[PDB]
Symmetry: none
Subunit: 126 residues, 2 copies
């Protein structure tokens, strides 16, 4: 297996605390040793970390990581872009930035929107 | 930070927990010999060995414990005397009496706690 695999596992088992401190350290290490991780791996790392930040309820931090993740995604069973946007939207909502929550969701092609994503939108339109 | 966190989980008694983490941290440290302070490396090792000890992997604990002491010689931190104790506990369970005795005997008498004196006494029968 692999270090990031282990972070995804720990993520699964819900050791959020651990994922946070480790992914954080991993990220620090990544900015100092580029190509210790592959671009797909970096995306994974960012999502796991942001998810972590999110569960810990530090939304502004999560927001920046999420948007960083999406940037990475632009470059070319990984976390779905659509899953990330959803949580991003959630962060914005709690932060009372609905303009921004709406934007990210609305930017998802209508045919690609999930029931969950449509609920959120619906609520936002109020 | 990180090392501090592992400490807290250990204290909390969340052992099967710290094993996974400390393990991954150890392998990382090894690959980035400059990622962690010598003092922090020591902590890691000790904490990992303890988890290896809660899970009952004594031979493996012995290894980590001895690497710990081996490191603490290059030099907050867990008592070197407490490590030596746990180390002797492993040898004992493993029935390596000679090795248990040696490590305890090697502690200056002035510094030997009741626990240690008892283990020794037991081992001397």
């Amino acid at each position: 297996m692999n270090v990031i695999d282990h972070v995804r596992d720990m993520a699964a088992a819900g050791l959020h605390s651990n994922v946070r401190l480790l992914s954080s350290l991993l990220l620090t290490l990544s900015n100092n040793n580029p190509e210790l991780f592959s671009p797909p791996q970096k995306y994974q790392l960012l999502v796991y970390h942001a998810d972590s930040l999110f569960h810990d309820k530090e939304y502004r931090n999560a927001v920046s990581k999420y948007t960083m993740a999406l940037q990475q995604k632009k470059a070319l069973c990984l976390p779905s872009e659509i899953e990330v946007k959803y949580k991003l939207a959630e962060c914005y909502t709690v932060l009372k930035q609905d303009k921004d929550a709406i934007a990210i969701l609305d930017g998802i092609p209508s045919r690609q929107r999930t029931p969950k994503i449509n609920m959120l939108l619906a609520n936002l339109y109020k």
